[PDB]
Structure formats: C-alpha cells, structure tokens
C-alpha cells in the first residue's frame, strides 16, 4: 500500500510525479515534431506532419490539466468514491482518431472508410467515458465491454482491410504500414486491460502505478508512433 | 493482497477504522480511569491515576487526530510515496515517559535515575521519528536501528536497576512491578519489529493490518498497563 510517484504539488495526489513526465514528454516530442517541420516541402509530409504533431500537442495540453488537477472528479460507486481523470478521454477523443487517420492516409482509402473508422474509434473513447462515469459495478463492466468490443472493431479493419491497401502499395509503404500497425495493435489493446483492472475497474492497482504505465504507453502509443511514422518514407 | 478496515472517511484511508476504534478505546479507557479515580481519598494512588490518566488520554487525541488525517505527512522515500502518521511519535513522546514514570514511581528512585530512563526513552521516540522522515533506505533503518538500542537501554534499566530497587520495597509493590514490566517489555519490544515490516521500513505489510496490531498494542500497551496497577494494592 505504499504508493508509486510523488506529490510535487501537495494536491494529496502523488500521480503528479507520472502525470508531470507525461507533460514534459508530450511537449518535448511535439516541439521535436515541430523542429522536423522546419525543413520539410513535400505536400505528403506537411500532411502527415501536421497531423502526427496535434496528437503530442492535444496531448501535452491534457496532460497539463492533470498535472494541476483540472480534468479531475469524483464517481460515488456503491460507498466509494473513484478518483476519474477525465481529460483523459477528451485527450483520447481526439488523439486516436488523428493517430488513427495517419495509417488511413498511408493506407489511402476512402472517405467512407475514413469516416467509419473514426466513427467507430470515437464511439469507443465515448462509451469508455460512460463507463468510467457509470453508477452500477454491473454498468461499467458493460460500458467497457462495448467500448472493448469497438476498439477491436477499429483494430480489426487496420490489420484486414487497410493492411492490404498499404500493401497494394509499395512495401516501404507497407512495412512502415504494418509495422505502425503492429505497435498500435498492441500498445492500444493494453489499455481496456489497465483500465478495468485499475481503479476504474478492479481497483487491483494504485492510481501511481496506473497513471505512470498509462503515461509510459501514452508516450510510446504518440510519440515513439509518430517517430516511427515521420522517419519512414512512407510519408513521401 | 487487499487490506482490512474500512474507509470511514472516503478518503482513499481504510486504516481510519482502526483509527476510529483506537480513539473509541483509547477514551473508554481513559474516562473509566477517571470515573475510577474521584473517589481516591487517599494521595499516593491519586498521584498514579493522574499519571496514568494521561496514557489513554493523550492518545485518545492522537488516534482522533490520526483519525482525521491530522498527525499525516507524505514522506519520500525513492519513488514511493510512504503515508507515514507522525501523531503516534507526538503521542509516544508524552505517554512512554509517563508510563515509564508509572512503574519508577512503584519503585522510588531518585531524579537522577528517572531524569535518565525518560531522557533515553525520550531519545528513543524522537529517533524514531527522524526514521520515520528520512529519505534514505538506509537512513531509515539506521535510526530504527538507534532507537532500537535506546529501547534496550530503557528495557535495560527497567529490568536491573529499577527491577531490583523495586523488590527492595514490598513484596506486593515488586509482584505487581515486575507485572508491569514484564508485558512492558513484551509490548514494547514488538513496536520496532511492526515498524521494520510495515510501511515505516520493509513495507512487507500493508498500512491496514499495521494500524490495527498498532492500536492493538497502543490499546494494550496503555489501557492495560494502567487497568492492571490501578487495580493493584501496590499504589497504596
Ligand atoms: C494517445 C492515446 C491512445 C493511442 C489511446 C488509445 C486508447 C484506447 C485504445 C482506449 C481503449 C478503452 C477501452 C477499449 C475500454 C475502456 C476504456 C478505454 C477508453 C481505456
Ligand atoms: C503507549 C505507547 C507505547 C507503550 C509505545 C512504545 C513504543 C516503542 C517501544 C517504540 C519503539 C520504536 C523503535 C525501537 C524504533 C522505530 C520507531 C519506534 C518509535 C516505533
């Protein structure tokens, strides 16, 4: 029962130390991102850039609520009261479908397509929201469900149809494709697991440990992918 | 790997509840001393129940006070956050010498003697206060291990110099003496190992059960303590 991080700020909570990381890193891989977009022309890449750098700035920007305890809130639930950081989702909300669109993009697929799987992918970041909002124990297991059900939905076309309209394409299209889609295929899937079984669910782990792997995938799941993505020249 | 008690607060604190029992006994103690006490119309055992008066009563406050996360500080160690209740050292830091004035008093000895036995028992707290706020593992258990040789002197004293100086007296001041300092010294000497284990040191048990056999001994340590030589013939 002895927590992990610590409470730079004295708000009690001592996620502040993971949440804090989580700000730095963010900012850092943007600017990172930005400073790569000073020596860019083609009008591929200024596509791609810019996307690929809202996703570590949104990010930045949730993460400084945090930090301060802006997107914070209580969710009485039986007799107790979950701590629910719901920047979170909003932070989500916006960055997967972006995440998201870049192998859209480097898969070139339609419009319908596109606004199915951000359809699908938003529906997800919502339903989850409900869920760690839900009253009923029973509820938030639902939610989480649909919400699971949805993510798995998304993850599937990437990996069906879009693998093969990346592959259509050239394999240096392909290969940064797939491989994208291999870190999102299981960064992404990792999180309804630490969601129902951190105090949004089971309550099994401490917020400390919770907050710091979220931020460990967070980072990895927006920066390291568009590291990965920005170098390729797939974007090209 | 989940802890017993209760959040009676709904502050992320399930220790309150042993908190809470603590100051239900600690007071109903104290108070049966009091409504015992009046009555006394002699001064040497009104000069006792004074004294032991303040044991439970002290502690009444503390534990209430504990109760409410008052005697609570955050106290870094690495990248963990230990909820480290400084109230007890406070508490201690009044109760120990007294209860230890208790048994110098059922045995006579001179200022010099008492000036000392409190004086390291005193020492023996406020170091293992400074081990309670030290950063450094090694810290840490370096002051334990100083406030664990005070609490040997204390103890030491208590069963040679004073042990004896009470057998001097009479047989009835000794067989309640040597009573008093035989479950002193089994108490006692099980708060250092509780600490090395509990979240103050090796962290092998959870801050839940630790509260709970911390009250118990507090409770035991205290109450009992006073229960038995107020029930004695010794302080007559
Ligand atoms: C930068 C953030 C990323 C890439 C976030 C991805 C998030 C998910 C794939 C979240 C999925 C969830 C469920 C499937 C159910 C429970 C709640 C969520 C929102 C954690
Ligand atoms: C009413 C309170 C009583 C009888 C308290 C007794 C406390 C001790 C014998 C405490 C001993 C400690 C050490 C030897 C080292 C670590 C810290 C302490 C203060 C827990």
Redesign the pocket.
Known sequence: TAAVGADLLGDGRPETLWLGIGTLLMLIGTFYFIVKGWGVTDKEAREYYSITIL?PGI?SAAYLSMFFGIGLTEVQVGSEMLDIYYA??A??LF??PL?LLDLALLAKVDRVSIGTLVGVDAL??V???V??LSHTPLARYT??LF??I??IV?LYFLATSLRAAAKERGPEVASTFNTLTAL?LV???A??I???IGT?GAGVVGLGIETLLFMV??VT??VG?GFILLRSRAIL
Do not use: H, N, Q
């Open positions: 996703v990010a979170r989702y932070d989500w960055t997967t995440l997800m970041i339903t989850g929201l869920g760690a939610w989480w919400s699971t949805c993510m998304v999102v960064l992404w899937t999180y309804p630490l969601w129902i949004e995938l967070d799941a927006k992918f």
